[PDB]
Design a protein around this ligand. Structure first.
Ligand SMILES: [Cl-]
Ligand SMILES: [Cl-]
Ligand SMILES: [Cl-]
Ligand SMILES: [Cl-]
Ligand SMILES: [Cl-]
Ligand SMILES: [Cl-]
Ligand SMILES: [Cl-]
Length: 271
């Protein structure tokens, strides 16, 4: 009977079991704890742990190598050295419309990592018609990835066909449609806070501790997306160019390991 906080009097919402978890146990049937790699780190199942009611996604200083896509040079690079590994929990089930919420505590270290609660689809390059959306990504929240620790991002990413060309749209390039910046009234690294988003075919509304911190028209986010909790690497350990991250020369172990904690994630679909 558990209902979402945005439920209005007289409404009924249904919890989506496959995209909801109170994290009493590490459920590998529901979550993929070692998804495809990207960025300048690698996911490791061991970096995702569940203890005392919370999911802990840890970023560790851990040298390793893996094939790396060097977008700037449009080439795959074998045995590419990386310096950090991290944790992820990606729902195997997909969806779009509904209310999503996660109770999260950010990592203590800053700057360097970004706790994230988001959802993304697969990229379908077969959709080439004008206006076709090949990729949809809704970021409920991306913490501590800006200059000040209290600045949070509630963004959108997508690929849409414009003038017959698949076009990438990111918060930085198309802020009016893809970016919601917010100055948190608290340090996200202190205690748990609730981050949510209500997705409908027409609107996307973001929430932080019950307050609306963002709203956009749902222009390109109707694709099936996997609900994800993950912690990414950021400056001073990264550089950003050619639409992707690259490692920086700062591979300090100080401040690591560091982890974000998720008390729970709840997803509902309105009746
Ligand atoms: Cl704990
Ligand atoms: Cl971006
Ligand atoms: Cl971004
Ligand atoms: Cl705790
Ligand atoms: Cl409205
Ligand atoms: Cl409005
Ligand atoms: Cl931490």
């Amino acid at each position: 009977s558990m209902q979402p906080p945005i439920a209005k009097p007289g409404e009924t919402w249904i919890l989506q079991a496959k995209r909801s978890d109170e994290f009493n146990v590490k459920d590998a049937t529901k979550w993929n704890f070692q998804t495809e790699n990207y960025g300048v780190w690698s996911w490791k199942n061991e970096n995702a742990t569940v203890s005392k009611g919370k999911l802990k996604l840890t970023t560790k200083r851990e040298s390793h190598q893996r094939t790396f896509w060097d977008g700037c040079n449009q080439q795959q690079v074998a045995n590419y050295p990386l310096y950090y590994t991290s944790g992820v929990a990606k729902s195997r089930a997909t969806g779009n419309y509904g209310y999503y919420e996660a109770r999260i505590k950010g990592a203590s270290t800053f700057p360097g990592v970004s706790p994230a609660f988001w959802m993304y689809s697969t990229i379908d390059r077969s959709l080439t018609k004008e206006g076709d959306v090949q990729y949809s990504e809704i970021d409920v929240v991306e913490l501590t990835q800006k200059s000040a620790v209290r600045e949070s991002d509630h963004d959108l990413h997508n690929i849409v066909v414009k003038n017959g060309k698949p076009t990438w749209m990111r918060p930085g390039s198309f802020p009016q449609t893809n970016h919601n910046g917010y100055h948190l009234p608290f340090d996200p690294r202190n205690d748990f806070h609730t981050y949510g988003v209500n997705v409908t075919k027409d609107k996307i509304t973001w929430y932080v501790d019950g307050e609306i911190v963002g709203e956009k028209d749902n222009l390109y986010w109707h694709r099936q997306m996997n609900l994800t909790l993950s912690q990414g690497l950021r400056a001073p350990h990264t550089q950003w160019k050619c639409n992707q991250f690259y490692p920086s020369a700062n591979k300090s172990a100080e401040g690591f390991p560091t982890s974000m904690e998720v008390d729970y994630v709840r997803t509902w679909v309105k009746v």
